[PDB]
């Protein structure tokens, strides 16, 4: 594993999580589109989400809480929006793992150029 | 083996002095049983006397209360070890917490008069 | 040897002499001696040795007739007990400069009887050996301490 | 508890005390009863050396060796009983245990709440006050004038009289009240 | 508690019921007034083993200072009755 | 009440034994019902994306 | 009581030592008092420092919570050695190997938590992305002042 | 009174105490309380249980999962 490797292997080719992203985002990519937030600041502020929950995928969290409020007290029937919000949190986690593996391949590029 | 301690003592069944005993030690145990029998018969006679209406005046408990209360200063002798250890235990942490309190308050007064310490929301001091 | 047993095992029951000191001889009455006889002369701490000229069935019949039922049970169930005595490495030196010859002993604590190594400590002690000035071996004696002496 | 300890524990008493501590710290260790009975007869295969030992110095040496073995292989938490000291319910029911002198301080309304029992307790107190003047005279003549006095109290030698020192034994509260 | 109180005949039947289950006891020889040393001929272990039988039978602890003195079923019945404090 | 027996089985009542049996039966019914309705305890999501087989062009190629 | 049966002074002579032993209802040969260090102990008899848990539990006592007898000499530290307070009962395992075991467990666990602080055991994942200049409008700040622009891109 | 069971119904055989007593007699001793402690292994109590029979208790009635919720 990565945790298995960075203890008692080389830490130059293996990233540390506190300096992520260490590289500027301009190298490797010609352009990057920003993650355009579907839920805006006014709808998020009026929906009153906690600052831990205000991620890049609160667009389905607001729909989850709206369907839970409009489907009270049939809380068993609000699992589809929980599945969609967990899929969007899985997409945020695959973007985080993608920037992790892009950081480790860019450090491999740094150690190949050096 | 089992090492002894002042706080975890040797039991008398594991004690080596219970296994090499002498007839003078056995006579001491017989006299200890005899004095416990005399004190138990006096206590049980005062327990089961129906003419008694008051409590049991315990002379050894009165002796222990008198020894812990009003015998210590009549049995004082001023020794240098008692004088030095009492002077340390009665003076030492006053100079120690004097140095702690004066160092912390000199630090606090210096930081207030220099402006580094800020009382942001400190209304009731 | 009595000074060495006094200074080798100080504070233990092995410090005292077999004879006892002169301040303890004068106070020994009859009842202390019969208390010692009733305590330490008990029958299974006693053996009956014969060597040659005897028959063992004759000795056991005579011990049934005579030396049976000496004493077995203690007085107040107060058993005597052996203790491991402390060896203290020490020095005593009785200085008598008008006395002609100096007797000096040096001893280390050895393992004792029940430990099996009395044979190997005795074979080291017998390599070292012994000498007296009446021995006619001279310089050619085998023990090198006696040869050097 | 009801009898009295001696001045000294004898060799047989210390050996049977080691047998009792061994056969409760076993079943503290060997939890199942098959293992308890197999290891208890192994403890009988261990008592068989101590049967005909005749020196008593070697018996006290074997007592010291078995006691050192018991303290080396003893359970850190032994088997305890609900009624034993150090137990689950050691003097748990002390809320009941209020003795018979406290019934003298009851109000007459509560004394008339129990009519026959207080009349029978008056009969027991009359038995106390007519028995004590011969009970305390019995101890001063059955007391030996020699220097050894035992802990066990004498019985009623006189016919028709109660045993001496009877009230504190006979009016303890019950150990399992309710 | 929910446990029933213990009669004297029930306590005697329980003590005799454990005592006939020992291996070296003849049940026709065993009466309530028979001494363990000189009337059934038992050893020093077997008296305290009868004491362990009462320990895991009645669920309470007999001290060893009483348990050395107890030597016959009638006063082991009377001692267990006087420890559990039953009126008959 | 019970007539507490000596050295044998107590006469166990049908209320106690069908009460405990239907309680454990309802517990395994709840376990099998929820394990049939969502197996997300063992499943979770579809798979975790292992970063070893990520293609470099959708990862973003490092230059040269 | 009177001044004779009340305690006082130190036993300097063996006849007043025997008188203090018959005061305290103890044996004459067992009467070892405290040493004369001027600490105010005096003629009080030094018992061995064993708590009341170590006495016989099944024997019926005159003072039942104290496990003492009437007229038996109460220890100077009996309030220290009462059954609510500190026991000096014999442990199954000895004190020095007990202290070595407990302090070895504590020091090994503190050093192992320092090892776990040195290697902080991270999942292969980046930081959690937060939008809108990393919530500087929502963390608490001046809305008239422009926030520092951080931009979280796609991959 | 209480109707005690008779002592003749507690034999040794059919128990693990029988196995303990025959191994202990192969050693060369006898067990004195083996007839006394045979009530824990003889009678209604004979037969050890298994971890299906304690944890999977009522699983044969708890396998009533219904697909009829249509
Ligand atoms: C897994 C756990 C490991 C750790 C487990 C615990 C380890 C330690 C276990 C220690 C067990 C203990 O040794 C058991 C034994 O040996 S018991 C021997 C009793 N046998 C006798 O006493 C002989 C018969 N007695 C008489 O014939 C009379 O009494 C007599 C005439 C001697 C009285 O003489 P006097 O005294 O009047």
Swiss-Prot record, chain A:
Membrane topology: Peripheral membrane protein
Assembly and oligomerization: Complex I is composed of 45 different subunits.
Recorded name of the encoding gene: Ndufb7
Subcellular location(s) per record: Mitochondrion inner membrane; Mitochondrion intermembrane space
UniProt keyword annotations, A-Z: Disulfide bond, Electron transport, Lipoprotein, Membrane, Mitochondrion, Mitochondrion inner membrane, Myristate, Phosphoprotein, Respiratory chain, Transport
Gene Ontology cellular-component terms listed: mitochondrial inner membrane; mitochondrial intermembrane space; mitochondrion; respiratory chain complex I
Cysteine pairs bridged by disulfides in the record: 57-88, 67-78
In-chain residues carrying the UniProt-annotated modification Phosphoserine: 71
Organism: Mus musculus
Part of the whole protein covered: 3 to 116 of 137
Function comment: Accessory subunit of the mitochondrial membrane respiratory chain NADH dehydrogenase (Complex I), that is believed not to be involved in catalysis. Complex I functions in the transfer of electrons from NADH to the respiratory chain. The immediate electron acceptor for the enzyme is believed to be ubiquinone.
Domain notes: Contains two C-X9-C motifs that are predicted to form a helix-coil-helix structure, permitting the formation of intramolecular disulfide bonds.
Statement: the UniProt record of this protein carries the keyword Membrane: yes
Superkingdom of origin: Eukaryota
Record motif Cx9C motif 2, residues: 78-88
Protein name: NADH dehydrogenase [ubiquinone] 1 beta subcomplex subunit 7
Family: Belongs to the complex I NDUFB7 subunit family.
UniProtKB/Swiss-Prot annotation, chain C:
Reported tissue expression: Expressed in neurons and astrocytes of the cerebral cortex and hippocampus (at protein level).
Protein name: Cytochrome b-c1 complex subunit 1, mitochondrial
Originating gene: Uqcrc1
Modified positions (N6-acetyllysine) in chain numbering: 65
Subcellular location: Mitochondrion inner membrane
Effect of deleting the gene: Results in early embryonic lethality.
Phosphoserine modification, residue list: 29
Function: Component of the ubiquinol-cytochrome c oxidoreductase, a multisubunit transmembrane complex that is part of the mitochondrial electron transport chain which drives oxidative phosphorylation.
Residues modified to Phosphothreonine: 31
Similarity section: Belongs to the peptidase M16 family. UQCRC1/QCR1 subfamily.
Protein source organism: Mus musculus (Mouse)
Subunit description: Component of the ubiquinol-cytochrome c oxidoreductase (cytochrome b-c1 complex, complex III, CIII), a multisubunit enzyme composed of 11 subunits. The complex is composed of 3 respiratory subunits cytochrome b, cytochrome c1 and Rieske protein UQCRFS1, 2 core protein subunits UQCRC1/QCR1 and UQCRC2/QCR2, and 6 low-molecular weight protein subunits UQCRH/QCR6, UQCRB/QCR7, UQCRQ/QCR8, UQCR10/QCR9, UQCR11/QCR10 and subunit 9, the cleavage product of Rieske protein UQCRFS1.
Curated annotation (Swiss-Prot), chain E:
Positions of modified residues (N6-acetyllysine): 20
GO cellular component terms attached to this protein's record: iron-sulfur cluster assembly complex; mitochondrial [2Fe-2S] assembly complex; mitochondrial inner membrane; mitochondrion; nucleoplasm; respiratory chain complex I
GO BP terms: [2Fe-2S] cluster assembly; aerobic respiration; fatty acid biosynthetic process; iron-sulfur cluster assembly; proton motive force-driven mitochondrial ATP synthesis
An MF annotation (GO) of this entry: mitochondrial large ribosomal subunit binding
Residue ranges annotated for the Carrier domain, each copy included: 9-84
Keyword Lipid metabolism: yes
Domain of life of the organism encoding this protein: Eukaryota
Residue pairs linked by disulfide bridges in the UniProt entry: none
O-(pantetheine 4'-phosphoryl)serine carried by residues: 44
Localization per Swiss-Prot or TrEMBL: Mitochondrion
Post-translational modification: Phosphopantetheinylation at Ser-44 is essential for interactions with LYR motif-containing proteins.
UniProt keyword annotations, A-Z: Acetylation, Electron transport, Fatty acid biosynthesis, Fatty acid metabolism, Lipid biosynthesis, Lipid metabolism, Mitochondrion, Phosphopantetheine, Phosphoprotein, Respiratory chain, Transit peptide, Transport
Keyword Amino-acid biosynthesis: no
Family: Belongs to the acyl carrier protein (ACP) family.
Name used for this protein in its record: Acyl carrier protein, mitochondrial
Name of the coding gene: Ndufab1
Shown residues in whole-protein numbering: 69 to 156 of 156
Swiss-Prot record, chain H:
Compartments where found: Mitochondrion inner membrane
TM region(s), chain numbering: 54-70
Coiled-coil positions: none
UniProt membrane topology term: Single-pass membrane protein
Modified residues (N6-acetyllysine): 11, 22
Keyword rRNA-binding: no
Main subcellular location of this protein, as a coarse class: mitochondrion
Modification note: Methylation at His residues by METTL9 enhances complex I-mediated mitochondrial respiration.
GO BP annotations listed: aerobic respiration; electron transport chain; proton motive force-driven mitochondrial ATP synthesis
GO cellular component: mitochondrial inner membrane; mitochondrion; respiratory chain complex I
Source domain of life: Eukaryota
Residues where N6-succinyllysine is found: 11, 22
Keyword vocabulary terms for this entry: Acetylation, Electron transport, Membrane, Methylation, Mitochondrion, Mitochondrion inner membrane, Respiratory chain, Transmembrane, Transmembrane helix, Transport
Assembly notes: Complex I is composed of 45 different subunits.
Function: Accessory subunit of the mitochondrial membrane respiratory chain NADH dehydrogenase (Complex I), that is believed not to be involved in catalysis. Complex I functions in the transfer of electrons from NADH to the respiratory chain. The immediate electron acceptor for the enzyme is believed to be ubiquinone.
Membership in a protein family: Belongs to the complex I NDUFB3 subunit family.
Name under which the protein is recorded: NADH dehydrogenase [ubiquinone] 1 beta subcomplex subunit 3
Species classification: Eukaryota, Metazoa, Chordata, Craniata, Vertebrata
Complete-protein stretch covered: 19 to 88 of 104
């Amino acid at each position: 594993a990565h945790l298995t490797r960075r203890y008692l292997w080389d830490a130059s080719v293996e990233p540390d999580p506190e300096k992520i992203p260490s590289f500027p985002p301009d190298l490797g990519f010609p352009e990057r589109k920003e993650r355009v937030m579907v839920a805006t600041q006014q709808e998020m502020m009026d929906a009153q989400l906690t600052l831990q929950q205000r991620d890049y995928c609160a667009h389905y969290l607001i729909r989850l809480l709206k369907c839970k409020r409009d489907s009270f007290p049939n809380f068993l029937a609000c699992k589809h929006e929980q599945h969609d919000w967990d899929y969007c949190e899985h997409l945020d986690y695959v973007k985080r793992m993608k920037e992790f593996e892009r950081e480790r391949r860019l450090l491999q590029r740094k150690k190949r150029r050096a | 083996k089992y090492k002894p301690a002042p706080l975890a003592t040797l039991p008398s069944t594991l004690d080596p002095a219970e296994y090499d005993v002498s007839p003078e030690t056995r006579r001491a145990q017989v006299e200890r049983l005899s004095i416990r029998a005399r004190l138990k018969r006096e206590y049980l006679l005062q327990y089961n006397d129906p003419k008694r209406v008051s409590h049991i005046e315990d002379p050894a408990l009165i002796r222990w209360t008198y020894a812990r209360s009003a015998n210590i200063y009549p049995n004082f002798r001023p020794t240098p070890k008692n004088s030095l250890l009492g002077a340390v235990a009665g003076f030492g942490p006053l100079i120690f917490w004097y140095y702690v309190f004066k160092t912390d308050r000199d630090r606090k007064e210096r930081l207030i008069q220099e402006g580094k310490l800020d009382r942001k929301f400190n209304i009731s001091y | 040897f009595d000074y060495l047993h006094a200074t080798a095992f100080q504070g233990t029951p092995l410090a005292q002499a077999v004879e006892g000191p002169s301040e303890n001889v004068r106070r020994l009455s009859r009842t202390d001696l019969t208390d010692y006889l009733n305590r330490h002369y008990k029958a299974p701490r006693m053996v009956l040795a014969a060597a040659g000229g005897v028959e063992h069935q004759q000795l056991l019949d005579l011990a049934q007739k005579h030396l049976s039922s000496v004493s077995r049970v203690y007085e107040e169930d107060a058993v005597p007990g052996l203790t491991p005595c402390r060896f203290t490495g020490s020095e005593i030196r009785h200085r008598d400069d008008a006395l002609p010859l100096a007797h000096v002993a040096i001893a280390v604590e050895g393992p004792g009887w029940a430990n099996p190594d009395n044979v190997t400590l005795q074979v080291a002690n017998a390599i070292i050996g012994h000498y007296d000035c009446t021995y006619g071996g001279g310089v050619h004696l085998s023990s090198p301490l006696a040869s050097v002496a | 508890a009801f009898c009295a300890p001696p001045a000294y524990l004898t060799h047989q008493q210390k050996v049977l005390r080691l047998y009792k501590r061994a056969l409760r710290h076993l079943e503290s260790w060997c939890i199942h009863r098959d293992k308890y009975r197999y290891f208890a007869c192994l403890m009988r295969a261990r008592f068989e050396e101590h049967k005909n030992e005749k020196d008593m110095m070697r018996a006290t040496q074997l007592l010291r060796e078995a006691e050192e073995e018991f303290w080396q292989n003893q359970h850190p938490q032994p088997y305890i009983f609900p009624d034993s000291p150090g137990g689950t319910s050691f003097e748990r029911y002390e809320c009941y245990k209020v003795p018979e002198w406290c019934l003298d301080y009851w109000h007459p309304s509560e004394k008339a709440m129990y009519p026959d029992y207080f009349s029978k307790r008056e009969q027991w107190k009359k038995l106390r006050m007519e028995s004590w003047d011969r009970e305390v005279k019995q101890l001063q003549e059955e007391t030996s004038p020699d220097g050894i006095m035992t802990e066990a109290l004498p019985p009623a030698r006189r016919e028709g009289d109660l045993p001496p020192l009877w009230w504190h034994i006979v009016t303890r509260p019950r150990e399992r009240p309710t | 508690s929910d446990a029933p109180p213990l009669t004297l005949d029930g306590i005697k039947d329980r003590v005799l019921y454990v005592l006939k289950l020992y291996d070296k006891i003849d049940p026709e020889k065993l009466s309530v007034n028979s001494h363990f040393m000189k009337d059934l001929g038992l050893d020093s272990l077997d008296q305290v083993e009868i004491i362990m039988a009462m320990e895991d039978e009645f669920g309470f602890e007999i001290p060893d200072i009483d348990a050395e003195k107890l030597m016959c079923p009638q006063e082991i019945v009377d001692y267990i009755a006087d420890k559990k404090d039953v009126y008959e | 009440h019970i007539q507490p027996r000596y050295r044998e089985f107590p006469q166990l009542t049908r209320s106690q034994v069908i009460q405990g049996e239907f309680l454990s039966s309802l517990m395994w019914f709840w376990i099998l019902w929820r394990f049939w309705h969502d197996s997300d305890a063992v499943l979770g999501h579809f798979s975790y994306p292992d970063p070893s087989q990520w293609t470099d062009e959708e990862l973003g190629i490092p230059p040269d | 009581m009177t001044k004779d049966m009340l305690p006082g002074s130190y036993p300097r002579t063996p006849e007043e030592r025997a008188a203090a032993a018959k005061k305290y209802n103890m044996r004459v040969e067992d009467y070892e008092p405290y040493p004369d260090d001027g600490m105010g102990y005096g003629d009080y008899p030094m018992l061995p420092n064993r708590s009341q848990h170590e006495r016989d539990p099944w024997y019926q006592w005159d003072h039942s919570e104290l496990r003492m007898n009437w007229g038996e000499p109460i220890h100077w530290d009996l309030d220290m050695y009462i059954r609510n307070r500190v026991d000096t009962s014999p442990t199954p395992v000895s004190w020095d190997v007990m202290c070595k075991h407990l302090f070895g467990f504590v020091a090994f666990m503190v050093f192992m938590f320092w090892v776990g602080h040195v290697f902080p055991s991270y999942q292969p994942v980046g930081p959690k992305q937060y939008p809108y200049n990393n919530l500087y409008l929502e963390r608490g700040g001046d809305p008239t002042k422009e926030p520092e622009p951080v931009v979280h891109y796609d991959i | 009174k209480m109707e005690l069971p008779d002592y003749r119904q507690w034999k040794i055989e059919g128990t693990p105490l029988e196995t303990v007593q025959k191994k202990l007699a192969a050693r060369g001793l006898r067990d004195p309380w083996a007839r006394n402690e045979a009530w824990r292994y003889m009678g209604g109590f004979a037969g050890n249980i298994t971890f299906p029979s304690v944890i999977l208790k009522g699983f044969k009635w708890g396998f009533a999962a219904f697909v009829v919720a249509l």
